[PDB]
Amino acid sequence: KVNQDGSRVLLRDVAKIELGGENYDIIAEFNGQPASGLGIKLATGANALD
Amino acid sequence: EDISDYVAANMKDAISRTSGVGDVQLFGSQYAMRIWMNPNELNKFQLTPV
Amino acid sequence: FSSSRWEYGSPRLERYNGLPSMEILGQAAPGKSTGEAMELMEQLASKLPT
Amino acid sequence: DVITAIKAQNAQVAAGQLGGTPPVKGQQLNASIIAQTRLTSTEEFGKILL
């Protein structure tokens, strides 16, 4: 908004804006070292080793 | 936050669609524009999260 | 309330497997055929930017 | 006004939780927040304010 004064308010002024993960629930450590991973879950009656 | 985003926005999409994958559980989350509001700074300029 | 600007843009963007891609269409040669035509093109692309 | 009063009072809203997901370091309790729940009986519907 622009309140009767000429002053401007912005999302930067009202809120902390950062490029972060969409959820903060599940985190992983590989030997105590910060890391992610691709946990693959096979299809129903697929081909496994193929 | 940084690795989990890259693992999703460079690799994850190529899997889960490849050789008969049921579903992939990514160990983290891809980046999102996270806006962290402030109640007092909202109250200051007469603003609701709406 | 509106500014007016002429600006360059693509009329037909392309994506291969969820990644921005551009289709090159070519020929073998009056001498060579496919095998070398591809082999040439594969490292004519390897000597491109990162 | 009858209809409008129903979906405003007879509805289940999804509020967050105490000690959410990106928490303040040293948070001890993590409990879910319950707000408006869905009405169950003929009496509760009778008590809808217009």
Swiss-Prot record, chain C:
Induction: Positively regulated by MarA, Rob and SoxS transcriptional regulators (at protein level). Disruption phenotype: Loss of susceptibility to contact-dependent growth inhibition (CDI); inhibiting cells still contact the target. It comes from the Bacteria. It is found in: Cell inner membrane. AcrA-AcrB-AcrZ-TolC is a drug efflux protein complex with broad substrate specificity that uses the proton motive force to export substrates. Homotrimer, with large domains that extend into the periplasm, interacts with AcrA and TolC. AcrA may be required to stably link this protein and TolC. Interacts with AcrZ. Part of the AcrA-AcrB-AcrZ-TolC efflux pump. Belongs to the resistance-nodulation-cell division (RND) (TC 2.A.6) family. This is Multidrug efflux pump subunit AcrB. It comes from Escherichia coli (strain K12).
